[PDB]
Short mmCIF file of C-alpha atoms and ligand atoms in Angstrom, two decimals:
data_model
loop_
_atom_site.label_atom_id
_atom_site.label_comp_id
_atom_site.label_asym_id
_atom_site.label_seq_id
_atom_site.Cartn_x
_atom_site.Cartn_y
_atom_site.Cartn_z
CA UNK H 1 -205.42 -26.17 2.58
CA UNK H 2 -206.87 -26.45 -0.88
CA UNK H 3 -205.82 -29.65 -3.43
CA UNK H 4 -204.24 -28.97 -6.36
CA UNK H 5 -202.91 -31.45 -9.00
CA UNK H 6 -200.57 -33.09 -8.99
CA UNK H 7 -199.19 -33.69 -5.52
CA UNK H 8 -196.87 -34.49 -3.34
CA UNK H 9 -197.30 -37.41 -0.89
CA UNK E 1 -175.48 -27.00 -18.94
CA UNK E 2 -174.53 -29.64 -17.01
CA UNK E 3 -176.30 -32.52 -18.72
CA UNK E 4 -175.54 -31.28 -22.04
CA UNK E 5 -172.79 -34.63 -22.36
CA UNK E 6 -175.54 -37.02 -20.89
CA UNK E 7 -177.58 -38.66 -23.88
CA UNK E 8 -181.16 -37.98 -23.79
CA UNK E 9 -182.44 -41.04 -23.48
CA UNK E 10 -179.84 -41.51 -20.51
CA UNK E 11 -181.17 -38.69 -18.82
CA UNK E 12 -185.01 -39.70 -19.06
CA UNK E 13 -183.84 -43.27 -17.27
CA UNK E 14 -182.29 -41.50 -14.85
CA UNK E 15 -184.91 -39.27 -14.36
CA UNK E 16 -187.85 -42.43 -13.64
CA UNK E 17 -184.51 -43.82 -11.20
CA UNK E 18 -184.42 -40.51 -9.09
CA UNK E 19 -188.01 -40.46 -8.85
CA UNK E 20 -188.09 -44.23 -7.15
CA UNK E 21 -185.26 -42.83 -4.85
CA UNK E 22 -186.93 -39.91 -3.89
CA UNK E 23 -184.89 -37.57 -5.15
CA UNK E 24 -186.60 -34.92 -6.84
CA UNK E 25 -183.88 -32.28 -7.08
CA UNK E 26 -181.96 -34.89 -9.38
CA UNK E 27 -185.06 -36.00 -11.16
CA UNK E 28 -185.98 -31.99 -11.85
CA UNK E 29 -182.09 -31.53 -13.26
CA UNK E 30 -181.88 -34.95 -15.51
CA UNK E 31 -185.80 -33.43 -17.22
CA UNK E 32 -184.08 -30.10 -17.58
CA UNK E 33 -181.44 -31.42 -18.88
CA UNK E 34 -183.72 -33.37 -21.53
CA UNK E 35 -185.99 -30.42 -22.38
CA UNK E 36 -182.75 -28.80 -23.31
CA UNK E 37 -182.01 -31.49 -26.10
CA UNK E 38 -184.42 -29.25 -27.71
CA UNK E 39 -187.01 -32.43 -29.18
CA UNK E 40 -190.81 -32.58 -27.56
CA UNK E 41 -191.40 -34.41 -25.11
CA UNK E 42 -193.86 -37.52 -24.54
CA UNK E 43 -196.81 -37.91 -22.36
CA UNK E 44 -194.80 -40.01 -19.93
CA UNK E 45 -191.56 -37.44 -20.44
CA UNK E 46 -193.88 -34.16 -19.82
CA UNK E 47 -195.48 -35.97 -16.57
CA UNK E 48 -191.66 -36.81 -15.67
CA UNK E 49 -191.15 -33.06 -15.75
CA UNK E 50 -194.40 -31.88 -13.77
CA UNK E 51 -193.57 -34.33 -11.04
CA UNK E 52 -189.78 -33.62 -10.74
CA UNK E 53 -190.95 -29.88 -10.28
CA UNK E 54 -193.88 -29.78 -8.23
CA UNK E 55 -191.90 -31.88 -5.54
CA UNK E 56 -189.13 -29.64 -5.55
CA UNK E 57 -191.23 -26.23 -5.59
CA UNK E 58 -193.37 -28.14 -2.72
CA UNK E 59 -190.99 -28.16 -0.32
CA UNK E 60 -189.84 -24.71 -0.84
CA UNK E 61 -193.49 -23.52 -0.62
CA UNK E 62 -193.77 -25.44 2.35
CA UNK E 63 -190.55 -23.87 4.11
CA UNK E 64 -191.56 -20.55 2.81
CA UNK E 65 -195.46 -21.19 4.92
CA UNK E 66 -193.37 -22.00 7.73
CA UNK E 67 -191.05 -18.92 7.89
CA UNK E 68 -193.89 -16.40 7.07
CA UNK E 69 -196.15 -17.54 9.77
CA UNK E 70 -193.03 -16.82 12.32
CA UNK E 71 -192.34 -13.44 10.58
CA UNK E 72 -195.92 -12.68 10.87
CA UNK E 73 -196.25 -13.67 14.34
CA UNK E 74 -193.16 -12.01 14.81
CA UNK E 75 -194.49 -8.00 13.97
CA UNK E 76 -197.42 -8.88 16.20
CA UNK E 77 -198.28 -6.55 19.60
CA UNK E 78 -196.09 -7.63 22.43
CA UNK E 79 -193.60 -9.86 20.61
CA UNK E 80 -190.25 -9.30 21.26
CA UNK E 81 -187.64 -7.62 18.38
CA UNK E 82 -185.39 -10.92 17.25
CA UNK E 83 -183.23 -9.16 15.36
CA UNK E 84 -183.33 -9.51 11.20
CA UNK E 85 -182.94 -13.65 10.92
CA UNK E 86 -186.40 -14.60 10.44
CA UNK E 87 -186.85 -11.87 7.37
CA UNK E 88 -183.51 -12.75 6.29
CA UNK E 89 -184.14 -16.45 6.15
CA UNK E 90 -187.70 -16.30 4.53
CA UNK E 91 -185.72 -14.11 1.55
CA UNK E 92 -183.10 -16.46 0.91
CA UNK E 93 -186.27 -19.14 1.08
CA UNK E 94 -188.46 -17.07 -1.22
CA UNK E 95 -185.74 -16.54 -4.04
CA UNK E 96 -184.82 -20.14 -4.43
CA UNK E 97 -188.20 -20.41 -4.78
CA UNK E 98 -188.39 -18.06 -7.54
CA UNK E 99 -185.52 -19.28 -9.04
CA UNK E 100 -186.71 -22.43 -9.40
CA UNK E 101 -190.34 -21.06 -11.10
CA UNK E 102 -188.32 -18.53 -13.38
CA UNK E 103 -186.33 -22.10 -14.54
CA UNK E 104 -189.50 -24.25 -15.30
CA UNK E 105 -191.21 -20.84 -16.91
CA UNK E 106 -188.05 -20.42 -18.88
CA UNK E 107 -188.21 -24.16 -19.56
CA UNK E 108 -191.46 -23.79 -21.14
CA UNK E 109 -190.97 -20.27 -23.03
CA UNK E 110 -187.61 -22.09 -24.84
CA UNK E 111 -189.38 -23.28 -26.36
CA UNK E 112 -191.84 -26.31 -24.86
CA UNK E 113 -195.05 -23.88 -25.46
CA UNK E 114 -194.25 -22.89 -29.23
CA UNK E 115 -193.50 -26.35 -30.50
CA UNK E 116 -196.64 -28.04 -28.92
CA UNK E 117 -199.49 -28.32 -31.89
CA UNK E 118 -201.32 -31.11 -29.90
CA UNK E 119 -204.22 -30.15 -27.26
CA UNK E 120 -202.75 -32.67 -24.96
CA UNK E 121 -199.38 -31.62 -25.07
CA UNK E 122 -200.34 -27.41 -25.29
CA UNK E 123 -202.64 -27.33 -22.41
CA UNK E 124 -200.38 -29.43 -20.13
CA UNK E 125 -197.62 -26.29 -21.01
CA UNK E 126 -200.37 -23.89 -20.34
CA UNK E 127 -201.37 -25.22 -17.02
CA UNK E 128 -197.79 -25.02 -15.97
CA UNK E 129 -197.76 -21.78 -16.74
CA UNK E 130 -200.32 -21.00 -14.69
CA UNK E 131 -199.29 -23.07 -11.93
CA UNK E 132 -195.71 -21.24 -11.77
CA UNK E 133 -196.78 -18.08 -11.98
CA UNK E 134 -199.16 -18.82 -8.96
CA UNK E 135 -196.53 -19.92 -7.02
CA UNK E 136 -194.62 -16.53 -7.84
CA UNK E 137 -198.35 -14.94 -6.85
CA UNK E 138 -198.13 -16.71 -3.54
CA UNK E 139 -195.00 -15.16 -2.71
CA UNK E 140 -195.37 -11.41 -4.58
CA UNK E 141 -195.93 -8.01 -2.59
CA UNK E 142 -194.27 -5.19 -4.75
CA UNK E 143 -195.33 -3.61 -7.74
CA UNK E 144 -195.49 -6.35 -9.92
CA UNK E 145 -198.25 -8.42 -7.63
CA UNK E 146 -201.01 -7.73 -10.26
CA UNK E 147 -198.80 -8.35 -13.78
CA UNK E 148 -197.79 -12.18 -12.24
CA UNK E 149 -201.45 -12.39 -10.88
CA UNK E 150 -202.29 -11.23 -14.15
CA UNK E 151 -199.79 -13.87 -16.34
CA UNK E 152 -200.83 -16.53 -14.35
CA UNK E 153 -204.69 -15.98 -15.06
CA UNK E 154 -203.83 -15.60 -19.10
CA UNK E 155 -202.16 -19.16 -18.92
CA UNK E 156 -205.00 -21.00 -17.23
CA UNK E 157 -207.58 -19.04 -19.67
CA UNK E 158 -206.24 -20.23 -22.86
CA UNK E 159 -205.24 -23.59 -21.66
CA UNK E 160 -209.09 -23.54 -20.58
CA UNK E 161 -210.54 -22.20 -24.09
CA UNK E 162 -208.71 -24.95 -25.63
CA UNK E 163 -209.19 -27.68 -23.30
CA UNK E 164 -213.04 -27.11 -24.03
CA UNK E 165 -212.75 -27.17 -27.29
CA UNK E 166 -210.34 -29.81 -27.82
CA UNK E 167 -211.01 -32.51 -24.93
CA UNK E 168 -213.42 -34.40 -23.46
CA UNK E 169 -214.77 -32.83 -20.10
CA UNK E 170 -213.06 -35.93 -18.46
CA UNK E 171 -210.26 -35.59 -19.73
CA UNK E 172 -207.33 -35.95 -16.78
CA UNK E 173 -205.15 -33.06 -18.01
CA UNK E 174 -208.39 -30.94 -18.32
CA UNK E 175 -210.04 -31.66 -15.01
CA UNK E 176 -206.27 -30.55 -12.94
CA UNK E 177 -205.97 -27.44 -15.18
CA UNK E 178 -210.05 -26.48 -14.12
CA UNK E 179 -208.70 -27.64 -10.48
CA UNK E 180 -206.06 -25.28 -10.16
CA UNK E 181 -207.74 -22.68 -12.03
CA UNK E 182 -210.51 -22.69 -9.84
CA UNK E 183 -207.63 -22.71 -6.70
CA UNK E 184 -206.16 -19.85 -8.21
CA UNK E 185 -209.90 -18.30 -8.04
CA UNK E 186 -209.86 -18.67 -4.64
CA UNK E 187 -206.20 -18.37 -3.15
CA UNK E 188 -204.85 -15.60 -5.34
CA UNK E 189 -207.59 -13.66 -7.13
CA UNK E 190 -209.88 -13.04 -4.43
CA UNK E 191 -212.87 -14.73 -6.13
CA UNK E 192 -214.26 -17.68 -4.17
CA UNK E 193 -217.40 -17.28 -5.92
CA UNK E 194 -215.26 -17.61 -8.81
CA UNK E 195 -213.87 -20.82 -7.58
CA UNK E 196 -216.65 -22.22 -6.34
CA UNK E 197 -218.82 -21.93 -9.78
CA UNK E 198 -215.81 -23.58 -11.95
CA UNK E 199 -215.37 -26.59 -9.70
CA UNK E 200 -219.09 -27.25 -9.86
CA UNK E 201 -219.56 -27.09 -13.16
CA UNK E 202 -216.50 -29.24 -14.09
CA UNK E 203 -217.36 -31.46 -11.83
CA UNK E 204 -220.91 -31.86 -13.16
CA UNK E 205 -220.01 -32.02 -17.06
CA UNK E 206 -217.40 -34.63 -16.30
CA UNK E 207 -220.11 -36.63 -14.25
CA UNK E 208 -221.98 -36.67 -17.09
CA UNK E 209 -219.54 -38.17 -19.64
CA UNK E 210 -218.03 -40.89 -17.07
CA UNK E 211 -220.59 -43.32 -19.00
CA UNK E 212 -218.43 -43.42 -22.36
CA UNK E 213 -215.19 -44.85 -20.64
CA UNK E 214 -213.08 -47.89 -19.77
CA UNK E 215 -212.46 -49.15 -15.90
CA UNK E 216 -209.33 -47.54 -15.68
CA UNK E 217 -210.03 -44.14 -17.57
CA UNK E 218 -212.90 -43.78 -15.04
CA UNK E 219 -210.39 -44.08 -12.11
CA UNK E 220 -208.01 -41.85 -13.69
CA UNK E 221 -211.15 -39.12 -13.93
CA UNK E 222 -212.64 -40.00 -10.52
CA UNK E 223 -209.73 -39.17 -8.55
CA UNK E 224 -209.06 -35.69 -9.83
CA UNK E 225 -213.31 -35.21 -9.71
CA UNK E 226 -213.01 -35.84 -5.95
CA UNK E 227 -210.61 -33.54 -5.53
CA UNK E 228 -213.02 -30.44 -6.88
CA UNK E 229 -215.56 -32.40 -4.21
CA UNK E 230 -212.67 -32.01 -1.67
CA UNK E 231 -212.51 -28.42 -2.57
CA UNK E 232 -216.26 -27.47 -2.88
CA UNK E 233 -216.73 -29.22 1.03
CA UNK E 234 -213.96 -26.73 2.11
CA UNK E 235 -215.11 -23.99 0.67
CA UNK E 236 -218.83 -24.34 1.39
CA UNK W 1 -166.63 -20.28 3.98
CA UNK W 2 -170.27 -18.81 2.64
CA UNK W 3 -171.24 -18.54 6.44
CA UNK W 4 -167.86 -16.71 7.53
CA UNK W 5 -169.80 -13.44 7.40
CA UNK W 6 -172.67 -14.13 9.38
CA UNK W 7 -172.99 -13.82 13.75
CA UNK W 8 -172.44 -17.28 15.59
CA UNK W 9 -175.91 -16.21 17.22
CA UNK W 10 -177.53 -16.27 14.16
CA UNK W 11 -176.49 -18.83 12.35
CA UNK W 12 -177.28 -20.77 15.67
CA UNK W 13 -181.45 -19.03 15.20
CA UNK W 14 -181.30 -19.83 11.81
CA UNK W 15 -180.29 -23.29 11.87
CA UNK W 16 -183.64 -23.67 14.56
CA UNK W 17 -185.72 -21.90 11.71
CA UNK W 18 -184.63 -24.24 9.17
CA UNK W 19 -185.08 -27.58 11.61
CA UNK W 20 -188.54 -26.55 11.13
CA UNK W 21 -189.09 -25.93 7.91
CA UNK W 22 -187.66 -29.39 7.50
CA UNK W 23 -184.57 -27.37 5.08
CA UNK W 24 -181.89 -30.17 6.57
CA UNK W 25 -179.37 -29.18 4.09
CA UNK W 26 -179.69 -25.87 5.10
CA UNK W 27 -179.75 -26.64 8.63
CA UNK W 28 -176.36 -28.31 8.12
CA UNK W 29 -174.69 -25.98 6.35
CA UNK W 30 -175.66 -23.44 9.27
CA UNK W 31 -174.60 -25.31 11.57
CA UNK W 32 -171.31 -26.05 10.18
CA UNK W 33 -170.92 -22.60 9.90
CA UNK W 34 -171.35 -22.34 13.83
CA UNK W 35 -168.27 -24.94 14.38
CA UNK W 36 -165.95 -23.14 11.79
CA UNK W 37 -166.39 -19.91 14.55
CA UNK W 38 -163.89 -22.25 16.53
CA UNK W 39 -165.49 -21.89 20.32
CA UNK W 40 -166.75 -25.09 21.83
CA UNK W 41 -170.54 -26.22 21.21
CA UNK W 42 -173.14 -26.34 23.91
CA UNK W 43 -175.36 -28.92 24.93
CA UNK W 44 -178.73 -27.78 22.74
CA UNK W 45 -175.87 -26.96 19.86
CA UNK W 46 -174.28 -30.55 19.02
CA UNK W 47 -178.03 -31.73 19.31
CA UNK W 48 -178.79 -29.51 16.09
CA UNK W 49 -175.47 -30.13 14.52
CA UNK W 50 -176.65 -33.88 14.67
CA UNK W 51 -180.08 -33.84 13.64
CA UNK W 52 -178.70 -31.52 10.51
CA UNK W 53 -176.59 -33.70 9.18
CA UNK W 54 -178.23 -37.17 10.26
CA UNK W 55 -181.08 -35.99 8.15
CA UNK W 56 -178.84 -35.07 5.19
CA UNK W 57 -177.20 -38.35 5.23
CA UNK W 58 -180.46 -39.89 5.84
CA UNK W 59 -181.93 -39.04 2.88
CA UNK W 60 -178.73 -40.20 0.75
CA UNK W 61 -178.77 -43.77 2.37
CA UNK W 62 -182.34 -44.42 1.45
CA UNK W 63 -181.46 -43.25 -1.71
CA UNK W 64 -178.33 -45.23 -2.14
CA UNK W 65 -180.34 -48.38 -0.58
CA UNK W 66 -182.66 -48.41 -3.36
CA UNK W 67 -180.27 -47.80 -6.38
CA UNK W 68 -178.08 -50.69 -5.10
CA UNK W 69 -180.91 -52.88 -4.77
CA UNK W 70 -181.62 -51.95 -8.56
CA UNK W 71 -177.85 -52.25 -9.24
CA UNK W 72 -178.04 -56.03 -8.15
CA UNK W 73 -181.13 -56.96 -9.31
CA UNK W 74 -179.85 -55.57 -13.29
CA UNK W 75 -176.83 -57.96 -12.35
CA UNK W 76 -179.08 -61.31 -11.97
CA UNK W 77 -179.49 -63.80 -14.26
CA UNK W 78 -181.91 -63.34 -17.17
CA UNK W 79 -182.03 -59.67 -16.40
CA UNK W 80 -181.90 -57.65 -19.31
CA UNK W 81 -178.49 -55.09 -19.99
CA UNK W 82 -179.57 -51.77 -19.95
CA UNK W 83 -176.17 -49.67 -20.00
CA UNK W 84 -174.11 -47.79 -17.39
CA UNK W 85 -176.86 -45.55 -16.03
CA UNK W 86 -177.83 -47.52 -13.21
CA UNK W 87 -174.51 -47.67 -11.62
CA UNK W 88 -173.60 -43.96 -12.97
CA UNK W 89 -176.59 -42.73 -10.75
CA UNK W 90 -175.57 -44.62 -7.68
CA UNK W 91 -172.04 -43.64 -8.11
CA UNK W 92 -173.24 -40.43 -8.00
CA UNK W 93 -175.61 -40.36 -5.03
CA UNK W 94 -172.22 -42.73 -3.17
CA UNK W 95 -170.32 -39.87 -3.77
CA UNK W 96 -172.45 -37.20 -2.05
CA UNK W 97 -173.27 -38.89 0.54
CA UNK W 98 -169.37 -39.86 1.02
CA UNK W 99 -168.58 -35.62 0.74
CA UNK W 100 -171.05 -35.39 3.53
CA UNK W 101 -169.38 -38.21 5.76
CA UNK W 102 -165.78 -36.69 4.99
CA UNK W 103 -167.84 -33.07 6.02
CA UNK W 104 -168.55 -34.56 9.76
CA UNK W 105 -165.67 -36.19 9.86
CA UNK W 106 -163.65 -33.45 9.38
CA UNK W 107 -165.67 -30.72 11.86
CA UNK W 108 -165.00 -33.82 14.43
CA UNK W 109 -160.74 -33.39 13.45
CA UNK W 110 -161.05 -29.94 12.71
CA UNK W 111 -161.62 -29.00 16.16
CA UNK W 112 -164.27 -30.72 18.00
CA UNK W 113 -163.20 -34.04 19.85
CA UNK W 114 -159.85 -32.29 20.62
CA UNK W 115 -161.61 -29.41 22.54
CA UNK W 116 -164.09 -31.42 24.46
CA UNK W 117 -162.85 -32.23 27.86
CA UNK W 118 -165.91 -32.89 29.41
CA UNK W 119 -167.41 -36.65 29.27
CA UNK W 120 -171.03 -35.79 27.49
CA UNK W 121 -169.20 -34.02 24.76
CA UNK W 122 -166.25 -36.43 24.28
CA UNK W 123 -168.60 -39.01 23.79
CA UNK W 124 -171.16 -37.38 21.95
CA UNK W 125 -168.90 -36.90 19.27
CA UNK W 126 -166.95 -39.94 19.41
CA UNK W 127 -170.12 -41.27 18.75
CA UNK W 128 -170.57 -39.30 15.59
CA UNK W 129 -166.97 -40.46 14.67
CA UNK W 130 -168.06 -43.82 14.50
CA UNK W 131 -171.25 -43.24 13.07
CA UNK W 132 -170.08 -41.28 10.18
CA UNK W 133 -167.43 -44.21 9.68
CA UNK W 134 -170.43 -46.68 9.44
CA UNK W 135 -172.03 -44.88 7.28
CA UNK W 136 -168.84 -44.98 5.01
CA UNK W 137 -168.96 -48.46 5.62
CA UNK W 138 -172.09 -49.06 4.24
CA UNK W 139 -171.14 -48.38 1.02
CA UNK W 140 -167.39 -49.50 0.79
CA UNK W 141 -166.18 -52.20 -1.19
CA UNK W 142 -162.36 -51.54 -1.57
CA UNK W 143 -159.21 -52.06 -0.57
CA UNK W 144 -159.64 -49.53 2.20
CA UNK W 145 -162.95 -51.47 3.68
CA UNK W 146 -160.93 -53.01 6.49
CA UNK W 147 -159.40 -49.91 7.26
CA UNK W 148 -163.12 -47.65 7.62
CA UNK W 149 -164.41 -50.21 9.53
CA UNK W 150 -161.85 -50.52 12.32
CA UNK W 151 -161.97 -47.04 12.10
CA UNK W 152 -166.02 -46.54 13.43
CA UNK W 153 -164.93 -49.42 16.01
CA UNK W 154 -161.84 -47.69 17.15
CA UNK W 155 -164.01 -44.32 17.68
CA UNK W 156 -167.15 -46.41 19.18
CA UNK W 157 -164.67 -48.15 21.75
CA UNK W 158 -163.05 -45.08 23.06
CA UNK W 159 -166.86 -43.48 23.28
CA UNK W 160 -167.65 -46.76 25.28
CA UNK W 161 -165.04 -46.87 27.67
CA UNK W 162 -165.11 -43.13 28.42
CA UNK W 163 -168.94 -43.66 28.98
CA UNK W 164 -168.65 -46.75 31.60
CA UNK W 165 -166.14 -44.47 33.46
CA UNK W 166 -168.08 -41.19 33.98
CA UNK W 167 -171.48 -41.46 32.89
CA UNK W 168 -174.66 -43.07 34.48
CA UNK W 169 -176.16 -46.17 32.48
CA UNK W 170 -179.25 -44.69 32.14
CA UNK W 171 -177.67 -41.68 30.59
CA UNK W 172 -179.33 -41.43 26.70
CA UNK W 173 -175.59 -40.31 25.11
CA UNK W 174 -174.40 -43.36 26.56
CA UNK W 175 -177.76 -45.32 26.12
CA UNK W 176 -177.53 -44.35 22.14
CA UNK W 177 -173.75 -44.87 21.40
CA UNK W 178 -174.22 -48.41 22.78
CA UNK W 179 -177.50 -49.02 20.91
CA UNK W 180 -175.50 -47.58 17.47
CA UNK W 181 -172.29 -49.43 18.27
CA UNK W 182 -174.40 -52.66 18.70
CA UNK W 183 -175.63 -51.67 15.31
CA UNK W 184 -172.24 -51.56 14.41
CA UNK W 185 -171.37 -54.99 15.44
CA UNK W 186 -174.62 -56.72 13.89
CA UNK W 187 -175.11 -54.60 9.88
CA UNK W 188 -170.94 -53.91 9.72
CA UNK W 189 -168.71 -56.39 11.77
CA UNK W 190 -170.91 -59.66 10.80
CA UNK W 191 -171.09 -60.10 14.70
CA UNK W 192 -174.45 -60.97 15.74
CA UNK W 193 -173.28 -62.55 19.05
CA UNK W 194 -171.25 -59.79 20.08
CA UNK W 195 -174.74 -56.90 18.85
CA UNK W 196 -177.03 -58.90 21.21
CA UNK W 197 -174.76 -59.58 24.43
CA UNK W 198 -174.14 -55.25 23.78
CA UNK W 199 -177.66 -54.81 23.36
CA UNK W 200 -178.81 -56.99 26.54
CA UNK W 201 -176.27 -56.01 29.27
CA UNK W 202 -176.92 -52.11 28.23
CA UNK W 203 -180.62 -52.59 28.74
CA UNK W 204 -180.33 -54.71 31.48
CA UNK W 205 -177.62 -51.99 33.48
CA UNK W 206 -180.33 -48.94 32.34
CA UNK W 207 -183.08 -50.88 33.81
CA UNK W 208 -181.63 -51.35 37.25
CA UNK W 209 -180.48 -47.57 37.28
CA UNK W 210 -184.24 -45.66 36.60
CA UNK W 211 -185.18 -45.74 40.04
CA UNK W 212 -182.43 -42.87 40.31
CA UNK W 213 -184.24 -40.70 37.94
CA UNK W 214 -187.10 -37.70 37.48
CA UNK W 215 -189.83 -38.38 35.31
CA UNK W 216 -188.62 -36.28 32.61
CA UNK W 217 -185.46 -38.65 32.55
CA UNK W 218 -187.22 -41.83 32.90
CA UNK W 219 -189.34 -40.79 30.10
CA UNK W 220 -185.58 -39.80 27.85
CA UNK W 221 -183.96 -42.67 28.66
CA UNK W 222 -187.34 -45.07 28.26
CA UNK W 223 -187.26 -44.16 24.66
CA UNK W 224 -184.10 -45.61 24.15
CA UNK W 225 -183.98 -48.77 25.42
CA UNK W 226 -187.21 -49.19 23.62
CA UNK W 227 -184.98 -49.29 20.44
CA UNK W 228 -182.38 -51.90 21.85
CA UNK W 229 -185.50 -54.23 23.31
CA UNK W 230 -186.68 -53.75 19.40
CA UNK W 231 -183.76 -54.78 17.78
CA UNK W 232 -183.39 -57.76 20.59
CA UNK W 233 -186.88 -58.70 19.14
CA UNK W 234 -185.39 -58.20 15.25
CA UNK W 235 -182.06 -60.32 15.97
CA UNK W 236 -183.11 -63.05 18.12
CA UNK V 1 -184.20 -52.34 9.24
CA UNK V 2 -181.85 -52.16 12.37
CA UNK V 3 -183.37 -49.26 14.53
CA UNK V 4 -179.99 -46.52 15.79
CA UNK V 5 -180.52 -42.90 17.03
CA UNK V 6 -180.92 -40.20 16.44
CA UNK V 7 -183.40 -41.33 13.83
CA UNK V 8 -185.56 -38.93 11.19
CA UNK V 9 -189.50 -39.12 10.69
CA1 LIG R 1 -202.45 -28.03 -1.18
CA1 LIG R 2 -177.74 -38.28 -28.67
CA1 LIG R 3 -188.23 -11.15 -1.87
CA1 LIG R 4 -209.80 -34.35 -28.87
CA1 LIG R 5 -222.55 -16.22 -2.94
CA1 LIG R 6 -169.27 -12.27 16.34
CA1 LIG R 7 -167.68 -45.28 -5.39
CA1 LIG R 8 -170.55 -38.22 35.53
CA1 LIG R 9 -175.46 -68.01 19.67
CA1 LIG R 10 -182.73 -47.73 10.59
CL1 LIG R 11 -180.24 -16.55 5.52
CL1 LIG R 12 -175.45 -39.72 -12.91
#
């Protein structure tokens, strides 16, 4: 479960 | 294609009107179809088309997730045969999902890279390069696993070389390229160490330049920063 | 048609693997597949042909909701004109969701209602006759607005009397045609009288009827009248 | 915001 950018709600 | 009767600036409007309804499959066609009109695109116009995209390849990459975790669970010890469904569903999952990568990558080959002359506008391209071409990595087992693995680290390395030459280390475009680079690191390339050393020091250079801007450029900054702190608590 | 060539069975497992990987459309289009076979739907079956296709048309009445809201707001006073894209776009998104309305509508001609003998499946999709109708409704403004709308109450009325005859009023087919059909009367028929006084007595007749029931039932048909007390608490 | 059912998330 790492963030990338951008994102989705 | 389709849109080729649709004015430009009729598509863009339509575009920012599919976004507020949630439709992103729309939103990702009308941008398409405006890319194809064959003039550059705008800051607002290029984040039309990364946001059209990434919510369309999201869900897919969420489906896909879904199905391979059954599939997987599927060829364990003691599970019973199910017949070909769950393989044959993840496929047709898997190559819409491609599809829709090979469109944005062809989107930005024809010719979105080669016209930008602007560091802004050329590392934006660059990253989504990168990005597409990790989604294809997520996906890849055959033979050609290490060339996409291999494209999408190429991307991300020259959108890096002239990110840090041309922007500021808090620069919003620059900070989510170093963010997904550094996921890439860690997801795809088997590198956490990798991963882990990018997202500190980008984190730490743009903590050092936060001084020199306005209220709203320093919320703009701080929210992608956080993310790199999201990742660096995760992965240490 | 694209799903002639695949097994009832699997197109049955597939439409469960695409439920949840949240792929609605593709749940749908399974599942309309499993109808075109031509033999009569089980229980567990018309539950995933309706979830398919209520989340399909879901997503195209938000959609529709807010591009009509922008629609009349552009149509104000003072507003400023900005062309034909507005209404283009929700012509467009009217459409679809209209194709997917006439879809239902025709699986429910084409064969269901005339197969189903037995009360739970009769009114089951009578139900879905009249709620594909309102949905129609929702968006018509024509000469044939009249004609739609008598035609979800014509379909919710036979449901309803079918139901009083054979079914338990604690039974959640019956419990949600009445709570859709009151619906019906209070967003459709400009009847708010008539949506309460349906709303009340079918509470009031499910509450005197759960000391008949399991847990697991109580708990099923609990859920329901829930959503009647809550629009009681909306409408009066 | 009538509530009817089925309903999605
Ligand atoms: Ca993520
Ligand atoms: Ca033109
Ligand atoms: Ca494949
Ligand atoms: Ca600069
Ligand atoms: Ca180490
Ligand atoms: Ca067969
Ligand atoms: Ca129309
Ligand atoms: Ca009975
Ligand atoms: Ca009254
Ligand atoms: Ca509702
Ligand atoms: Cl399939
Ligand atoms: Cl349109």
């Amino acid at each position: 479960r790492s963030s990338s950018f951008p994102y989705t709600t | 294609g389709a849109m080729g009767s649709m004015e430009r600036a009729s598509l863009i409007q339509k575009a920012k009107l599919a976004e507020q309804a949630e439709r992103y499959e729309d939103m990702a066609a009308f941008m398409k179809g405006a890319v194809e009109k064959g003039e550059e695109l705008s800051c607002e116009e290029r984040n039309l088309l990364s946001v059209a995209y990434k919510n369309v390849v999201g869900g897919q990459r969420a489906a896909w997730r879904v199905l391979s975790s059954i599939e997987q669970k599927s060829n364990e010890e003691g599970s019973e045969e199910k017949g070909p469904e769950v393989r044959e569903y993840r496929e047709k999952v898997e190559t819409e999902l491609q599809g829709v990568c090979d469109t944005v990558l062809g989107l930005l080959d024809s010719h979105l890279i080669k016209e930008a002359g602007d560091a802004e506008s050329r590392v934006f391209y660059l990253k989504m390069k990168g990005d597409y071409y990790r989604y294809l990595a997520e996906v890849a087992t055959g033979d050609d696993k290490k060339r996409i693995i291999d494209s999408a680290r190429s991307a991300y390395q020259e959108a890096m070389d002239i990110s840090k030459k041309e922007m500021p280390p808090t620069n919003p475009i620059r900070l989510g390229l170093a963010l997904n680079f550094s996921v890439f690191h860690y997801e795809i390339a088997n590198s956490p160490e990798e991963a882990i050393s990018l997202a500190k020091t980008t984190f730490d250079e743009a903590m050092a330049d936060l001084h020199t801007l306005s209220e709203d450029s320093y919320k703009d900054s701080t929210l992608i920063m956080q993310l790199l702190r999201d990742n660096l608590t995760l992965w240490t």
